[PDB]
Paper text:
We report two cocrystal structures of a mutant Ralstonia solanacearum lectin (RSL) in complex with the recently described sulfated terphen ­arene (STP3). Ralstonia solanacearum lectin (RSL) is a case in point with four polymorphs identified to date. ,, RSL is a neutral trimer with a toroidal, β-propeller fold. Sulfated terphen­ ­arene (STP3) is a large, rigid, triangular macrocycle comprising terphenyl sides, methylene vertices, and 12 sulfate substituents. , Owing to the sulfates, STP3 has high water solubility and a low propensity to self-associate (as evidenced by 1H NMR in D2O). We then turned to the mutant MK-RSL, which contains a Met-Lys motif at the N-terminus of RSL.
The MK-RSL–STP3 cocrystals grown in PEG diffracted to a maximum resolution of 1.6 Å. The structure in space group C121 has an asymmetric unit comprising two MK-RSL trimers (6 protein chains). Only one molecule of STP3 is present and is located close to a C 2 symmetry axis. The macrocycle and the interfacing protein surface are partially disordered. Clear electron density is evident for only one vertex of the macrocycle that complexes Lys1 in one protein chain. The adjacent N-terminal methionine (Met0) is disordered. Owing to the degree of disorder in this structure, we do not consider it further for characterizing STP3–protein interactions. The cocrystals grown in PEG (low salt) include only one STP3 per 6 protein monomers and the protein–macrocycle interfaces are partly disordered.
Residue numbers in the entry:
A (entry chain A), B (entry chain C), C (entry chain B): 0 to 90
The structure:
């Protein structure tokens, strides 16, 4: 019995938390902004996940690294929707 | 599981570091505060681990996400003990 | 199928990002500082990887925890080359 795999990030002092879970090839996102957990907009394929985030002033930026096989895809949140990032592995 | 699985967080400029290792279904904690590595109070079940933390002043707040199977348990350090948090993977 | 396993850290407001990938027993590093992804100096054996980093002023310090079997090795970046750290899982 394998286990799901998670990645977590947080920012500010409320704080906001985002937890990403890779489960059966699908990565989903749960969100905390101080008043209960809810399901976020991130939904992308992957068996492995890592995450980092940074603030510019008050604006959060999130990068999620989703891996299937040997291919890692980066996904970007910059305040107005998830988009694919430029990340590639060694060529 | 071939190898153990780790997660790490750090805070301040000394820094303090906490490293969580999932090994044989148990997660344990090693701590650095600038003066040598020692074993921390965290000990909970899990095959997978992730962590995030934030400061309020000089006071650290840690959240560890411990997963076994498809069950992810959030553990909260807010200065005095590890308490089960409100996190669920789905409302 | 099995997939590679990653860990990510970031700092500053550009930001700089480092992504560590464990692939078939080797951990390598990809780097972003605003101007394209490139291959970093980090290269160490391991089947699992986690990372944390902290700034002291504008100087970044990175700790990478590489695991093979039950043995976790800490690798330290402090501005001038990767060195093995004092981390042990026991004692
Ligand atoms: O406010 C919720 C939300 O917009 O926060 C930023 C990202 O985590 C999004 O996926 C998420 O749906
Ligand atoms: O704004 C998108 C982006 O430029 O952000 C920094 C890195 O995450 C890049 O790979 C990514 O394409
Ligand atoms: O000083 C050690 C300690 O109290 O630091 C905060 C948490 O990491 C605890 O598990 C840990 O025992
Ligand atoms: O104080 C505990 C708590 O409220 O902290 C913020 C989140 O980690 C919650 O899931 C958790 O229950
Ligand atoms: O500029 C790239 C670099 O020096 O940045 C700090 C560390 O990530 C190093 O491994 C890496 O080669
Ligand atoms: O400067 C290296 C070092 O002292 O930094 C703090 C911890 O990462 C230690 O394990 C490590 O040896």
């Amino acid at each position: 019995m394998k286990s799901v795999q998670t990645a977590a990030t947080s920012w500010g002092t409320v704080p906001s938390i985002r937890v990403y879970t890779a489960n059966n090839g699908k990565i989903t996102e749960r969100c905390w902004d101080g008043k209960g957990w809810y399901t976020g907009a991130f939904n992308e394929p992957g068996d492995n996940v890592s995450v980092t985030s940074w603030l510019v002033g008050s604006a959060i930026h999130i990068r999620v690294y989703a891996s299937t096989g040997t291919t890692t895809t980066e996904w970007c949140w910059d305040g107005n929707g998830w988009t694919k990032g430029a990340y590639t592995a060694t060529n």
